Amino acid sequence: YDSLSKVGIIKGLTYNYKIKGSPSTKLMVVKLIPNIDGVRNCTQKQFDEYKNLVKNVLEPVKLALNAMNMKNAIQNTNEAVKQLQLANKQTLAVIDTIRGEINNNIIPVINQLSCDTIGLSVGIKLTQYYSEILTAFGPALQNPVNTRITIQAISSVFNRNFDELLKIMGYTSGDLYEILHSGLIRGNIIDVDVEAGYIALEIEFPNLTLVPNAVVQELMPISYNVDGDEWVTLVPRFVLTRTTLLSNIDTSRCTVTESSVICDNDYALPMSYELIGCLQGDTSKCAREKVVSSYVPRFALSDGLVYANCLNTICRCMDTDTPISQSLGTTVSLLDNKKCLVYQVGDILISVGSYLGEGEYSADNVELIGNQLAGINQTLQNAEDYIEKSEEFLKGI
Amino acid sequence: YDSLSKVGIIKGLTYNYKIKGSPSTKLMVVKLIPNIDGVRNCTQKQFDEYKNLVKNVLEPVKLALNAMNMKNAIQNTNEAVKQLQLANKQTLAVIDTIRGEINNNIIPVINQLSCDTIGLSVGIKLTQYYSEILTAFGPALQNPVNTRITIQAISSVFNRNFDELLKIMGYTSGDLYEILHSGLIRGNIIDVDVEAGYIALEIEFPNLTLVPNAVVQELMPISYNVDGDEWVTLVPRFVLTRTTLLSNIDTSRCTVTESSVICDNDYALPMSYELIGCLQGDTSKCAREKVVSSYVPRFALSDGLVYANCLNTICRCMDTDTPISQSLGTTVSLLDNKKCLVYQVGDILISVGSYLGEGEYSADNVELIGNQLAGINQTLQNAEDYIEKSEEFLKGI
Amino acid sequence: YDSLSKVGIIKGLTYNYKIKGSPSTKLMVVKLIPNIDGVRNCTQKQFDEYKNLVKNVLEPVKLALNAMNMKNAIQNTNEAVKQLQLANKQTLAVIDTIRGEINNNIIPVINQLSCDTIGLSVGIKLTQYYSEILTAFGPALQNPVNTRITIQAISSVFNRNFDELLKIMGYTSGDLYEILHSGLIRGNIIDVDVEAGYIALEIEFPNLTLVPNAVVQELMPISYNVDGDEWVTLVPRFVLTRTTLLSNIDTSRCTVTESSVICDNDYALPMSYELIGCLQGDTSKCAREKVVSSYVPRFALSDGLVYANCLNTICRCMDTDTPISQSLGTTVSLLDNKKCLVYQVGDILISVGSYLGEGEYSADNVELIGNQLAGINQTLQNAEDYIEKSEEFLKGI
């Protein structure tokens, strides 16, 4: 690239080149189902319900398996005393009655209910276990489709340290970020067992290989006003540059990222010398053509950078009587937020968003006989005390 | 396009053209963790378990942080009465015993257990909170990979009204449907804090710009029988048409939808006049070639519309002795469900599905001492009543 | 293909060809919400909370709806006895007191609390129902975006038998595996009702049609050393071969899989005879060009199969003083794990992973007055027994 802004060529982002062609198939099955058991037969119903739910959610995937006056009176009063004793017997009866209720269900059954409540807590733990299942595979558990594998499944092998994971194997920041943002890893379920509860999935560990000085720029063709006509140069929108000798870039089967391009194989091939000469400054070798369509854009846009050309189109931003433009020699002019509030290139309205960010969303808020006994004891103590002394010493031998 | 059915050109679907080149990066962090606290120290264990689960599910993502005879007898009977009083004392003892149990654990501890049950309900609410977390980001929470952002996260900013959201910013139905069905939005996690519990993600609000009269038709080349040979015209499968002057369409880096095509940038370029002349009716300028491969299809298929050519191939649908065809001039003939039950164009079996729809799936179904006391009181009342009057008036001064 | 290894052409994987062009739109709505009701008004709060959660998670999606000295003494002692009777009355009072507590909340309210615990279990079941919802659609429930539909939703129509599902409709293993690993099915939500709780989604049942003998090989161009220069033949990286007459392959709008390529329509077209002649052995017709870029690879890589060319580059694996190479006639040489421990072709380090598989991850582990009554009864029985006989027979007529 040189000082050739007059032909409408504009550089863009630089993308690194990486190669992934090393597979690995050494999968081994490791059990991960949490152990559940009953010690007091309280969680048996909960265990059965959990097993039924696990069976229901876990499809048998058989398709994959197949494919791959006084004298009498003192007597009568005594009888009355006996009647009082009979009344005491009746009280003894009530002593059993409430006790029978205590013997019926009050003590044991309620206590058993308490264990059920503990089982309920276990059920809550089961729900947490379900979350641990959900974070285990996520979408991969739903279907055996190649998709992003959860980081928690790949990590936490021995000490959950990501630094050790990235240091044990030679890797850089760029390829790791590309993998973590694109999802080049692939996952497929092998077999699912309802009873033993083990799920095996194909773990993918790509080993990206980089190429030194594998820089490539993006070119946006822009028509230029030469003489009276408007000429446009036929140049590919993506060409690799390297000192003097370079080659073209084919994106028919390549995936691009924020700052790199990922391709399964290599596609380098020799390119014609005419294009190299035209890019080097020889405008005569460039294939110029007259524009015959109004749909050809006169301005380029790259990640919010607008090269507005006000020589032919309009660049009104806030008013309609300001014919701001540039010199005849200059073709592309930068139009950023430092020139006007809301710039509108051409006759098409374009601007940025007004509000953007994480909206406020709150889930919920958590909010919030002693005297009688003493009197009875005193009466009992005093009565015998004043009756025994009175009766014993009054009559004797 | 004109009346040129003899050369095998067939129009298809029309796709609108839109441009997205305006980014926006003004992300701000807003807390969304539901407040949880304990008032009676009952949910402390539940709170600790929830915090541990949150820490376990939320990876520290340190990689992203680093990168970016008577006289004696009446005495003895009295002693017996005292013995009965002693028996009453024994009853008093039992009065404490059961009461001691009431004082031990019956009243307080069970009540405390009740609070635990309330905590269990809180735990259930926690599970609901987990669902509110799951709907918050979904897959985006699992990994920082560019994917579809949940509508509930973007919406519900102030009043959950989608109409206000679509009216505040200028948008149409087509681009909104394309975004909602394709997932052009991108999402990346910035930072995750275990303690404060805030998660920040890159919110994407694309601003699609439309182009008036940006219609483009799809062309399917079909060989035609001229003289004895079968000639096929070399025409691109996707070319834009606009009155008279038009241009070609390049789909090497463009994504197509049901009724539109989305491209990051513009790709308009002048096209040769020979192709325009050939498309306009000048069959001489068309590049005709003799077919030298049996794999070339003699019929076209577009969204269930079959242009079966029975002149050369066969069009048996229900029998094998019906040579139904068309005139020599006509090349493509429509073959819909109104002509035969199950049409089979050529020697390849093709038909529609037999059963399609939402299958029936049901989760589960929810299914479902008074007399003794009165007698004791009456006996107590009558005994004293008939003993006091008898004793008092019988003996005196 | 013939014995033409000297020109650098290497065969690769074979991909089958399939056509999908038969849509189907006969969607019908079927209710799937589990029935919930209250029999004892215990789950009313739980039902309200579940309904509120369902309303919150289920967006109204209005955008889609709009778009589409003695004498006195014996008296006094009797009064004392009456006092004892009064004490008994006091005991009767306590008989009510505890009973009042039993009548207050001990029996009924606690029992009501028990029903609440049952409701808590129902709440746990509700969480399980949520899981049944999560497995119902998964990501499709989150947004109406075309993605993989869960197998459990498509299956379980009548007897959950996958064999019957694959036998009722004519299908093979290859296309079924391609669908299950790529996700060609599309899904879109039609309408969502909060009250009736029915969700309708577009079910996709592709009917892939195969083409006999639709085999195609992959060709990787490799430069060859002829005379002093290094010549590379210009040959497309993907060309179909069939006996003698064949045609080119265009992948501009085709998706490739592990062992097949899926395209929406057909793209067969005649190819020039010069390329066929060059591929058949006529090296004169081949378009050879001198390499003018060092980025051109001298070795090919295909699924871990490396054709290392040590004639020009280096093939050091374990040492740096071993110039192992091949004969001048041979250009490509296989370099597998049976030749060296860690092979490094050229000056770029490349190898396989060290550790790969499912890591160990454990969620959690589940761990674990009779004597007094008899004495009172004996005292009561003996006292009356020895007092009645003594009193009755001592005094009489």
DSSP B119-159: HHHHHHHHHHHHHHHHHHHTHHHHS----PPPHHHHS-SSS
Residue A67's domain is classified under what CATH number?
A: 1.10.287.2480
Residues of A within 8 A of B252 (CB-CB) are: 251-252
Residues of C within 8 A of B151 (CB-CB) are: 59, 61, 142-143
- C-alpha dihedral sign at B147, B152, B158, B163: positive
Residues of C within 8 A of B291 (CB-CB) are: 270
CB contact under 8 A, A379 and C87: yes
Tokens read off for A354: 């007004």
Question: Beta partners for A302?
Answer: A305
CB contact under 8 A, B80 and C253: no
Tell me: do C40 and C144 sit in the same domain: yes
Q: What are phi and psi of B248, to 5 degrees?
A: -75, 170
Calculate the CA dihedral of residues C36, C40, C42, C48 and round it to 10 degrees.
40
d(CA A169, CA A163): 10
Give me the DSSP letters along A152-196: HHHS-SSS--HHHHHHHS---HHHHHHHHHH------EEEE-TTT
d(CA B182, CA C144): 9
Classify residue C216 by burial, with Cβ atoms within 10 Å: 0-12, 13-18, 19+: buried
Tell me: do A39 and A88 sit in the same domain: yes
d(CA C238, CA C219): 6
Tell me: do B71 and B203 sit in the same domain: yes
Tokens read off for C193: 């009702």
Tokens read off for C94: 């306590």
A359 lies in some domain? no
For chain C, first and last CA: distance in Å?
144
Tell me: do C248 and C349 sit in the same domain: no
**Which pairing describes strands A16-19 and A260-263: parallel, antiparallel, or unpaired?**
parallel
Strand C254-256's sheet: what is its strand order? C209-210, C16-19, C260-263, C254-256
Tell me: do B193 and B323 sit in the same domain: no
Q: Give the list of residues 6+ apart from residue B65 with CB closer than 8 angstroms, or none.
A: B191
Domain of B269?
1-20+209-292
Amino acid at A320: T
C35 lies in some domain? yes
Classify residue C383 by burial, with Cβ atoms within 10 Å: 0-12, 13-18, 19+: buried
Quick one: DSSP state of residue C6? G
Q: What are phi and psi of C7, to 5 degrees?
A: -95, 5
In a mutagenesis test of the A interface, which of C10, C356, C384 is the best target, namely the one with the most A β-carbons within 10 Å? C356
d(CA B386, CA B380): 10
CB A237 within 8 A of CB A250: no
Tell me: do B244 and B304 sit in the same domain: no
C364 lies in some domain? no
A379 lies in some domain? no
Residue A277's domain is classified under what CATH number?
A: 2.40.490.10
Residue whose C-alpha is closest to residue C384's, from B83, B93, B94 = B83
Of B154, B246, B380, the CB nearest to A87: B380
Amino acid at C349: L
Residues of A within 8 A of B386 (CB-CB) are: 80
Residues of C within 8 A of B48 (CB-CB) are: none
Q: What are phi and psi of C58, to 5 degrees?
A: -90, 105
Residue whose C-alpha is closest to residue B239's, from B253, B225, B252, B250 = B250
Is residue A54 helix, strand or coil?
A: helix
**Nearest-neighbour CA in chain C from A11: distance (Å):** 22
Question: Beta partners for C216?
Answer: C240
Tell me: do B231 and B341 sit in the same domain: no
A109 lies in some domain? yes
Of C23, C246, C271, the CB nearest to B304: C23
Tell me: do A334 and A213 sit in the same domain: no
CB contact under 8 A, B85 and A180: no
CB B185 within 8 A of CB B148: yes
CB contact under 8 A, B369 and A94: yes
Classify residue B297 by burial, with Cβ atoms within 10 Å: 0-12, 13-18, 19+: buried
Q: Give the list of residues 6+ apart from residue B283 with CB closer than 8 angstroms, or none.
A: B7
Tokens read off for A84: 């009082």
Tell me: do C27 and C14 sit in the same domain: no
Question: Beta partners for A333?
Answer: A308
B261 lies in some domain? yes
Tell me: do C77 and C201 sit in the same domain: yes
Residue A314's domain is classified under what CATH number?
A: 2.60.40.1690
Backbone angle region of B160, left / alpha / beta, with phi > 0 → left and psi within -120 to 50 → alpha: left
Is residue B352 helix, strand or coil?
A: coil
Q: Give the list of residues 6+ apart from residue A88 with CB closer than 8 angstroms, or none.
A: B84, B87, C380
d(CA B292, CA A268): 31
CB B221 within 8 A of CB B287: no
**Nearest-neighbour CA in chain B from A290: distance (Å):** 8
C379 lies in some domain? no
A16 lies in some domain? yes
Tell me: do B56 and B203 sit in the same domain: yes
Backbone angle region of A145, left / alpha / beta, with phi > 0 → left and psi within -120 to 50 → alpha: beta
Residue whose C-alpha is closest to residue B269's, from A234, A287, A217, A348 = A234
Give me the DSSP letters along A254-279: EEE-SSEEEESS-------HHHHHHH
Is residue A366 helix, strand or coil?
A: coil
Quick one: DSSP state of residue C7? G
CB C168 within 8 A of CB C10: no
Buried b (16+ CB within 10 A) or exposed e, B356-393: ebbeebebeebeeeeeeeeebeebbeebbeebeeebee
Residue whose C-alpha is closest to residue A86's, from C369, B107, B310, C388 = C388
Residue whose C-alpha is closest to residue A261's, from A146, A202, A178, A351 = A178
Q: How many domains is chain C partitioned into structurally?
A: 3
Q: What are phi and psi of C383, to 5 degrees?
A: -60, -50
Tell me: do C64 and C193 sit in the same domain: yes
- Residue reference for tokens 């093709």: B350
Amino acid at C285: K
Q: From residue C372, how far is each of A132, B86, B87, C376, C378 by CA, in Å?
A: 57, 12, 10, 6, 10
Quick one: DSSP state of residue C34? P
Classify residue A19 by burial, with Cβ atoms within 10 Å: 0-12, 13-18, 19+: buried
Chains that touch C (3 or more CB pairs under 8 A): A, B
CB A270 within 8 A of CB C296: yes
Residue of chain C whose Cα is closest to the Cα of B231? C270
Is residue C278 helix, strand or coil?
A: helix
Whole-angstrom Cα Rg for chain C: 45
Strand A224-226's sheet: what is its strand order? A224-226, A229-233, A288-290
Of C130, C268, C270, the CB nearest to B131: C130
